[PDB]
């Protein structure tokens, strides 16, 4: 039992995985076994979702999070997001589940049977955390892998049947992307957009050409970065800025994953392009807009002149102006005027919502969609009672958008905490005081008093 | 000299797994019966006849919604003794009338006395000062003020808190809507003592753990402490410099620090109790008269204070008919206060 | 040494009465801006159209508030999540009507308080301490993020951010209860366990150490003089304190390890408050408290109320009265 108690390792059982820091073979096993757990869940969860799936109800009425990801890639769906074939969902689930066995086998082998350190076995596979060149090499390999993955998305969208396009002319449908956006002014433009209202940084991406083009760039950037990191060693200024240890590296990645988690939370909460509402349900903004649309339609059918109808406050009951003058829906949904969606855009003119289009061009499909979205707003209880907090039991619904945003907030948050924990510890360990202050060399005792 | 009193005293004070003591004679039966009564009621007993509510696992409630609910308003402040004039010895009827509520509140009160006596008794035996008992006066003042004094000023025990998770939540919301209790400076002092105490708990624990001396080779640092060691396990001097530099002030005296940790939450609780004693009499901090004079005369004048009272008016109108069934309130749809649409 | 070197040495100096540091370089200006704006606004700001319905709410002392009613009022619902710096307004009068001070204050504050957390790490490093005080501070910090940034993001407006004021805070609480049934949410329940328990353990620790202070003084002086700053010897007898507490409950329910005790004292409130913060941050995306409305039904189908249904009636009161001129349509969807 090498390094598998507190007396030999210096780490208690509850920090037992820290016993692995310098045991590259066993740590490889932990990592590969873990990847197995991730892949297992993707596989198992998909098959559970498929088993539980009723094709003629919306996905979002059924507690699905994975089938919607598969559908968004253009698999299993047709016009409007209707399910035309569940077999692609079965395939994805099965292949992930099978693959997990392989990862679990490798993981278990390296963890309990293989060489506990890799360095005397292989100069290629072994590593010292403190060897800057080998760390950038392995980083480089993994960048190449990630770039190939981004190009897989590109290949799916351009060469293997397309992606689900909620914006497709004449109604959402799977569409092949033939003209991905390559112009770096557009692609990198998203990156410099404000994250505030009406701008929304990268989360505002609203067409598949930009999405695909973005992955072309990312894939090429990542492959190039990987080659770069294989072929170079960190420069002097980077050597002086960072802590070079396994725990430090963990810390940096925790920081990064935290940031990505908060971004993902915002993506699924606001974005209805890469998270089509057909699969994920309406966004919060979308459903609030849909309510105003619903009652505008109803009251106008009854004879209301909706442009001229003054509400209790003096603002338009149905229609008002945004702070820059655009015609928008009124009531509290004034906050959501930056919302855009395919059911609403046909009513939009150069100056915003167009009164003549409103009076004459609203189609029954738009009424249906607005009613659907108003009544599947992402509000609901922890026990999955759909609606406002005061609603009675009846409807079993919590939007996938709420599940995905809340879970990823929680996870991003604790990952920030882990970043702080491990970055602070990495620092202290590198400097030599992570176990406490030396009684005979207490630094404050050598400093002048403050007063 | 060597009599039965002294012999019993010997036995009561043996050093055993669970200490008994003279205080035990009061504490153990009272605590057991309060806890047992709660578990019995939440598991099996209704609130149909007292409140028009289901309140037990038996009827289909969960851990959050079960309660032992207060007696009907018509019982007034009856002790509701099993052998009393209401239940007349009938255990079933006693349960249906809310006898378990006074059972739990009164055995609980005597149990708390017993617990505080235990704190004194043990302190005396071990030879420490009785500050833990002194500190426990705060929980006593809260229990006595909220569970006994409050309903005693009101019409009946009906309006005490019912012993239950959701039932306690209802008690909070009642206090907002009817007493505007958030506005009360005694509650605010309560808040500051509780949140302040929580702050001090967090910050003192973190400071000690982050100024530890290296007293072992282990990266897990708990084993580098020995209860019998003479020396401080952390550096007060480094802790002091850190806080002086971060926040501007810092503790320098460990006895002061640990006294302050008693004082803050204990004082907060005691202030909150004083407020609740005023609420027993509806002697609220409900209003700012100057605000009301202005708002009555000036329909454009609006503050967060006025906004909250509108919420309070909603709470009262919407909750009263079901929350106070003995009043037989019928509020026609047309009288209910509502804003636009909702 | 050159100027930059000298400057760096001063910024990171362990000898400044108040530590500056690199975090402090951002913290100091942002906190001062937030503070100065808050003070001026709290005193002298005119009414603010919080709900975007041309219904201005007075928050300042000079416009009829006292300390309890006063606030800096959230930015207008018309603005939503749009960034409204001074320079996006046509004038300061407009900026003020629309609640511009709120955004300036909360953004400078959240940046500054984040740097306060970083600064706690930084000084711990300069002094050779262990690094995790900042992690305990992440709990209140996360909570401030939840109420000033995350909740607005979820609901689509800074108008739904917590107001900067005492009564404003209560308004935020009551409306949150109406809209999310927070009391019935297990993360707020964990938060309560966190702060009630933090208070309990604070009193308990204080009382037990105070109980066991070693006699070093006479009856006509404060026992506090029995401890001298920086003495090597512990000032209370932990063996006696454990002897006491272990008998109060039973032996193995009491800590005889000071490190383990002080870790528990940190962890209990911090973890509970992290769940409080996560409660607010997840109700931000309308995953709400448990809803047992009409969960208990008799043999016929009659609803048999429980205490959840009574809560529901209170919540309804709040819901129907809040922002009484702002809703035109039947559902409050954000």
């Amino acid at each position: 039992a090498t390094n598998r108690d507190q007396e030999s390792s210096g780490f208690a059982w509850w920090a037992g995985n820290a016993r692995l820091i310098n045991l590259s073979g066993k740590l490889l096993g932990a990592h590969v076994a873990h990847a197995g757990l991730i892949v297992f869940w993707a596989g198992a969860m998909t098959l559970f979702e498929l088993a539980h799936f009723i094709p003629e109800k919306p996905m979002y009425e059924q507690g699905l999070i994975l089938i919607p990801h598969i559908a968004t890639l253009g698999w299993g769906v047709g016009p409007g997001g209707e399910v035309v074939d569940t077999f692609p969902f079965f395939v994805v689930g099965v292949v992930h589940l099978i693959s997990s066995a392989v990862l679990g086998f490798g993981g278990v082998y390296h963890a309990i049977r293989g060489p506990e350190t890799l360095e005397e076995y292989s100069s290629f596979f072994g590593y010292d955390w403190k060897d800057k060149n080998k760390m950038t090499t392995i980083l480089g390999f993994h960048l190449i892998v990630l770039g190939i993955g981004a190009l897989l998305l590109v290949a799916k969208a351009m060469f293997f049947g397309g992606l689900y396009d909620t914006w497709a002319p004449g109604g959402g449908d799977v569409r092949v992307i033939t003209n991905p956006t390559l112009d770096p002014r557009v692609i990198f433009g998203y990156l410099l957009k404000s994250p505030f209202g009406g701008e929304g940084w990268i989360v505002s991406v609203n067409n598949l050409e930009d999405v695909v083009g973005g992955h072309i760039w990312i894939g090429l950037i990542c492959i190039a970065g990987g080659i770069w990191h294989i072929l170079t060693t960190p420069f002097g200024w980077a050597r002086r800025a960072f802590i070079w240890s396994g725990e430090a590296y963990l810390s940096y990645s925790l920081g990064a994953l935290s940031m990505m988690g908060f971004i993902a939370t915002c993506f699924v909460w606001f974005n209805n392009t890469v998270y089509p509402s057909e699969f994920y349900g309406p966004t919060g903004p979308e459903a609030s807009q849909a309510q105003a649309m619903t009652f505008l339609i109803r009251d106008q059918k009854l004879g209301a002149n909706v442009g001229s109808a003054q509400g209790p406050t003096g603002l338009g009951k149905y229609l008002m102006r945004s702070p820059t003058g655009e015609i928008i829906f009124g009531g509290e949904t004034m906050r959501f005027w930056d919302f855009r969606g395919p059911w609403l855009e046909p009513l939009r003119g150069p100056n915003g919502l167009d009164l003549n289009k409103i009076k004459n061009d609203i189609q029954p499909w738009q009424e249906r969609r607005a009613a659907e979205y108003m009544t599947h707003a992402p509000l609901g209880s922890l026990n999955s009672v759909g609606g406002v907090a005061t609603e009675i039991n009846s409807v079993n619904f919590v939007s996938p958008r709420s599940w995905l945003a809340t879970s990823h907030f929680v996870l991003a948050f604790f990952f920030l905490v882990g970043h702080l924990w491990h970055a602070g510890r990495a620092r202290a360990a590198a400097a030599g005081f992570e176990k406490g202050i030396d009684r005979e060399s207490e630094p404050v005792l050598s400093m002048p008093s403050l007063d | 000299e060597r009599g039965w009193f002294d012999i019993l005293d010997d036995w009561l004070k043996r050093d055993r797994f669970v200490f008994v003591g003279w205080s035990g004679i009061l504490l153990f039966p009272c605590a057991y019966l309060a806890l047992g009564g709660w578990l019995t009621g939440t598991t099996f007993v209704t609130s149909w006849y007292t409140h028009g509510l289901a309140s037990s696992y038996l009827e289909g409630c969960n851990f959050l919604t079960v309660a032992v609910s207060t007696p009907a308003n018509s019982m007034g402040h009856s002790l509701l003794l099993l052998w009393g004039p209401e239940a007349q010895g009938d255990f079933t009827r006693w349960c249906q009338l809310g006898g378990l509520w006074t059972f739990i509140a009164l055995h609980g009160a005597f149990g708390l006395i017993g617990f505080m006596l235990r704190q004194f008794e043990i302190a005396r035996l071990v030879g420490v000062r009785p500050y833990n008992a002194i500190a426990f006066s705060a929980p006593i003042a809260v229990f006595v003020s909220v569970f006994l004094i409050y309903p005693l000023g009101q019409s009946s025990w009906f309006f005490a808190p019912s012993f239950g998770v959701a039932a306690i939540f209802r008690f909070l919301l009642f206090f907002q809507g009817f007493h505007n209790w958030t506005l009360n400076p005694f509650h605010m002092m309560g808040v500051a003592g509780v949140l302040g105490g929580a702050l001090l708990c967090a910050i003192h624990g973190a400071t000690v753990e982050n100024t530890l001396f290296q007293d072992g080779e282990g990266a897990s640092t708990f084993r580098a402490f020995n209860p019998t060691q003479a020396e401080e396990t952390y550096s007060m001097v480094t802790a002091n410099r850190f806080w002086s530099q971060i926040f501007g002030i810092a503790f320098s005296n460990k006895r002061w620090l640990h006294f302050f940790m008693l004082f803050v939450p204990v004082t907060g609780l005691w202030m909150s109790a004083i407020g609740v004693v005023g609420l027993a009499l509806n002697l609220r901090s409900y209003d700012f008269i100057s605000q009301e004079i202005r708002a009555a005369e000036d329909p454009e004048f609006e503050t967060f204070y006025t906004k909250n009272l509108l919420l309070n008016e909603g709470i009262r109108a919407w909750m009263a008919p079901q929350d106070q069934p003995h009043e037989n309130f019928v509020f026609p749809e047309e009288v209910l206060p509502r804003g636009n649409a909702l | 040494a050159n100027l930059w070197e000298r400057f760096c040495n001063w910024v990171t100096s362990t000898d400044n009465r108040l530590y500056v540091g690199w975090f402090g370089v951002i913290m100091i200006p942002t906190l001062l801006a937030a503070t100065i704006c808050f003070v001026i606004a709290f005193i002298a700001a005119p009414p603010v159209d919080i709900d975007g319905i041309r219904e201005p709410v007075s928050g300042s002392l000079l416009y009829g508030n006292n300390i309890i009613t006063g606030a800096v009022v959230p930015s207008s619902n018309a603005i939503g999540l749009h960034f409204y710096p001074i320079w996006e307004a046509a004038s300061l009068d407009e900026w003020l009507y629309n609640g511009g001070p709120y955004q300036l204050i909360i953004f400078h504050f959240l940046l500054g308080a984040s740097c306060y957390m970083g600064r706690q790490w930084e000084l711990s490093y300069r002094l050779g301490m262990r690094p995790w005080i900042c992690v305990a501070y992440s709990a209140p910090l996360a909570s401030a993020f939840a109420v000033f940034l995350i909740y607005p993001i979820g609901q689509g407006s800074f108008s739904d951010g917590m107001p900067l004021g005492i009564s404003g805070t209560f308004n935020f609480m009551i409306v949150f209860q109406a809209e999310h049934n927070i009391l019935m949410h297990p993360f707020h329940q964990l938060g309560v366990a966190g702060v009630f328990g933090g208070a309990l353990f604070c009193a308990m620790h204080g009382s037990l150490v105070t109980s066991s202070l070693i006699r070093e003084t006479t009856e006509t002086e404060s026992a506090n003089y029995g401890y001298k700053f920086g003495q090597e010897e512990e000032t209370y007898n932990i063996v006696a304190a454990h002897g006491y507490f272990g008998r109060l409950i039973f032996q193995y329910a009491s800590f005889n390890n000071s490190r383990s005790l002080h870790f528990f004292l940190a962890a209990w409130p911090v973890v509970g408050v992290w769940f409080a913060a996560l409660g607010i941050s997840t109700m931000a995306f309308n995953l709400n408290g448990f809803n047992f409305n009409h969960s208990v039904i008799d043999a016929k189908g009659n609803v048999i109320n429980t205490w959840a249904d009574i809560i529901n009636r209170a919540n309804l009161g709040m819901e129907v009265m809040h922002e009484r001129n702002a809703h035109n349509f039947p559902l409050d969807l954000a």
């Binding site: 403050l450 | 002091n240 002030i249 | 005193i43 002392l61």
Partner: peptide, 30 residues
């Protein structure tokens, strides 16, 4: 008068912070 009184108390508190920090009794080791 009310406003003056609130602002006065606040300003006294702020001054107190200054004295409590910069003119504290300095902590001294033994």
């Amino acid at each position: 008068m009310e406003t003056i009184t609130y602002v006065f108390i606040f300003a006294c508190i702020i001054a107190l912070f200054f004295f409590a920090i910069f003119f504290r009794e300095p902590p001294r080791i033994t």
